Amino acid sequence: TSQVRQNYHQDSEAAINRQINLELYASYVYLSMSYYFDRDDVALKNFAKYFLHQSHEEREHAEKLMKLQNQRGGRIFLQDIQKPDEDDWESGLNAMEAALHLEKNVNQSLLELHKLAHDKNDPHLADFIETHYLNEQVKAIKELGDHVTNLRKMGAPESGLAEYLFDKHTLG
Amino acid sequence: TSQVRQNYHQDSEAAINRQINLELYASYVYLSMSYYFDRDDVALKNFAKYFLHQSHEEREHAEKLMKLQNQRGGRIFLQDIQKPDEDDWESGLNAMEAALHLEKNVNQSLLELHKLAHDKNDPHLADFIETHYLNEQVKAIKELGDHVTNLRKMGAPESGLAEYLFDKHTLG
Amino acid sequence: TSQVRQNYHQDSEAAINRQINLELYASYVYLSMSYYFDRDDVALKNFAKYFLHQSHEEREHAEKLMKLQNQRGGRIFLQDIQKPDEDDWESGLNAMEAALHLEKNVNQSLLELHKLAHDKNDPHLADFIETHYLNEQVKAIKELGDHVTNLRKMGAPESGLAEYLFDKHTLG
Amino acid sequence: TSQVRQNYHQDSEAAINRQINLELYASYVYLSMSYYFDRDDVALKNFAKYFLHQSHEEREHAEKLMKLQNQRGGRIFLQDIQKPDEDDWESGLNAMEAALHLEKNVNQSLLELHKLAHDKNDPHLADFIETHYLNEQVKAIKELGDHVTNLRKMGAPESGLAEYLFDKHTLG
Amino acid sequence: TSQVRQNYHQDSEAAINRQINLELYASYVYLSMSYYFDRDDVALKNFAKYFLHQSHEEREHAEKLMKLQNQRGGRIFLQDIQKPDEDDWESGLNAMEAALHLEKNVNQSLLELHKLAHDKNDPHLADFIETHYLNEQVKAIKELGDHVTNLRKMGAPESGLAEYLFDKHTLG
C-alpha cells in the first residue's frame, strides 16, 4: 500500500491501466493512418499531418493517464500495444469512419470508467475524466462526424478529386 | 512495383520494417523507464524527463525510417510493439545499463542493415543510415557509458544519495 | 598529371563528364517543358515556374559537378547538349511522367557512378554523390510521383479543369 | 494560326528561333570560358565569376526571347546547342577577344533581325530589340574592348603577372 | 574491452592513433612555416597568419580524431611529435609546395584508413572520415595548388616583389 493512496480502489487502477493501453492502441492506429496517407500511391499530406497530430494527442492522453495513476498511489502495468486491424485504409472517408468508430469506443470506455469511479465514490478521478477527456472526446467525435459528412457530400471515395479538395481546403 | 522504386531490394525493405519495429520497441522501453522513475517510491523527475526525451527521439527515428521507406518505393508493414521485458527497473544505474544494452543492440542492427545495403549496392540508404543514425547512436552510447561510469563512481545503487545527486547535478 | 590529382581514376573522370552532360540534357528538357507550358494555347504559369526552377537546379548540379571535377585534378570535356526528344509535351501529366522518367534515369546513372567510385576505392566522390545528389534525386522522384498520382486522381489529362486546379492549388 | 498572332511574319518567327539558339550557344561558350578559368593550372576566379555572369545574362536573353516569341503568337522550335569550338582558351586575353568576336557576331545577327522586322513593318519587335538588346550589346562590346585594351597595355599574355593583376584589380 | 566498444577493430584503433600523430606532425610543420615567415629577414605576415590558421586547423583535426577515438571505445596512445625536416623554408613558393606535399600525404593516409575501415565493415568511421576530412583535404589541396600556380605565374621565387604582392593581395 502506497503512502499517498487514499480512496483509490484496485478496480479503478485496473481500469486506468486498461484505458492507458486503449489510448496507446488509438495512438498506434492514428500513426498507422498517418503513414498510410504518406504512401506514394496515396499522396495526401494534410491527412497524414492530421492523423499524426491525433496520434500525438492520444500519446498525451496516455501520458496524462499514467501521471494520474502515479498520483493516486496506483501502480502502472503496461501491456503489448496491438497493431491496427488494417494495414491499407482504402481511402480517406474509410479512415475517417474508422477514426470515428475508435473515438466512439474510447468514449464508451471512458464513460464506463467514470461510472465505475462514481460507484467507487471517487469524485477526484470522476471530475478528472470529466474535465480532461469527456469534452475532448465529444469535440473529436463531432469534428470527425463533420468531416465524414463533408466527404460524403462531395463524392468520396468515388471521386478522388473530392478527397484532394478536402485535403487542400479543409485539412490544409 | 512502385513507380518510384529504383535500386531498392525487398530484403532492404524487410530490414527497414524490422528496424522500424526495433525503434518502436526502444521508444516503448524508454517510456516505461520514464514512467517507472515517475513513481512515488522512486521520485526521480530528471531521469523521467531524460527517458521521455529518449523515447521521443526513438519516435522521431521511427518516423524518419517510415518516411524513408515511403520515399524508396517500399511499403510499410507494422507489427506488434512488444512490452519491455521488465516493469520494475530496480534503480537508476540498472536503467542506465539497460538503456546502454538496448542502444548497443540497435547499433548492431543498424550496422547489419548498412552491411546489407552495401551488399545490395544501395549507396543512398547506406549514407542515410551513416549520417542520420550511426553518429547519433555512437553519441548516445558514449553518453550512457559516461552516465554509468559516473553512477558507479558515486556509490549507486547502494547509495540513494548518489542517485539523488546525479539526478540533481547531472540530469538536472 | 595534375599536381592535385590523388586517387582519381580516368574512368571516374569520364563518368563525371558524362554525368555533367546528362545534367545539362536534363536542364535543357526542363527548360523545354517550362517554355512549352508558357505557350498561349497551354497557359499554365505555375508549371512553367516549377520546370524553370528544376532546370536551374539541374544547372546547379552541373556546375557543382564541374567544380568537383576541377577539384579532383580531372579535366572537363564538354559535348553537344542534345535537344529534348519532344517539342510538344501533350499535357501536364505527360510532362510530369517524362520528368519522372528522366529523374529515374539520372538516378540510375548516379548509382552506376557511385558503384564505379566504390570499385575505384574513391570514398571522397562516393560520399559526395551520396550527400549532394542521392537524397536530392530521391526527394525529386518522390515529389514527381506524388504529383503524377494527384494528377491521375483528378481526371487529367481528360479534364483540363483538373490540370488548372493542380496548377492553382498545388504548384501555386 | 494563333488567336493572338497579329502582324507577325513566319520569317520573323524563324529569325527569333535562330537568335534564341544563338543566345544559347553564347551562354554555352561563356560557361565553357568560366569553367576553363576554374582549372587548377589556370587559377583565375574573377574571370570565372565574370564569364558565369555573362552566361547567366545570355540565359536571361534567351528566356526573354522565348517569352517574346510566346507573346507574338509564334511557336518555339529549339535545336541542338553546339559546343564551343575550343576547349582550352589559352589565356585571358584570348578569351576576352573570343568573347568580343562572339558579341560582335550576336550584334550583327540582332541588326539583321531588326532590319528584317523593319522590312516586315513590325515596330513592336523592332523597338523590343532596340531597347532590350541593342544598347546592352553595345555596352558589352565596349566593355570587352576596354578589357582587351587594358590586357594588351599590361603585357598579357606574355606576362602572367599582368593577368593576375587584371583579375585582382579590374575583375575583382 | 570497453563497454561502449562495438564493431571497432584494433587495427582501426592503431590507424586512428597514427593519423592523430600525423595531424600533430602536420600542425607542427605548419607552425614552423608560420614562424619562419615571421623572421625579420623574411617579413611576410600574411603567410605567417595563414600557416598559423592551418596549424590550428590541424590541431582541431587531431582533437576531433581523439574525440572519435574516445567515442568508439578505443584507447589513445600518443607518441613523439617529430620536428619538421626543414628549419629554413627558402621562400614562399617552396613552403606552399611543401604544404601541398604534406596535404597529399595526409590525404593518402586518410584514404588508406577509409579503405581499412571499409574492409573492417565500419560504416560509422567511414562516413566520419568522408564528411569531416575528405572534402576538407580536397579543398585544401585545391587551394594550395591554386596558390602554387599563382606564385609560379608571377615570378616567384626569383621575384621577391611577386611574393610581396601575393602576400598583400591574395593572403591579405
Add this chain to the structure above:
Amino acid sequence: TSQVRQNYHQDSEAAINRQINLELYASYVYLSMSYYFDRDDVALKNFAKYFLHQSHEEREHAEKLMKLQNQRGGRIFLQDIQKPDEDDWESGLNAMEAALHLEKNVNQSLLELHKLAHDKNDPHLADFIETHYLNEQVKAIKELGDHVTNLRKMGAPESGLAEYLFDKHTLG
C-alpha cells in the same frame, strides 16, 4: 648578425629556444591530461576543458616566446616535442599534482632564464619575463595548490564522489 640584434647574447637565444621547447612539452602534457579525462571510464568533462585551456595557454606562451625571439634578432631552432612520461594519469588529484610539478619546473626554468638575462645586462627580456610570465606562473601554481588542497580535503582519490563534486562545483 641580424640588423635588429642589439644587446642580445647567444646564450639568451639558446635559453629562449629551450624555454620554447619546454612550453611545447607543457602544452603536450596538458593536452594528454585533457584527453585522458575524456576517456569513457574516466568521464570528467570539466577537467578536460580546464586542461585543454591550460594547453592553449602554454601554446600562447610558446607563440609569444617565438615572437620575442624574432623581435630580438635571434633565430628560432625547434626540436622534438617529447611525449608525456605517463599515458594514464591515475585520477584527478594525481593529474593536479603532476601539473603543479610541471608548473614549478617551468617557473624554475623562467627564474634561471631571468637570472641569465640579468647577468647579460638585458633589461628588456628581464622585464618581459617579469610581466608576461612570472606573475602568470605564480597565479597558476597558487591555483593548482588550492585545487590540490581542496581535492585532499574531500577524500580524493579514494572517493570518486569527491572528484565528481570537484568537477561539478569547482571546475564547472
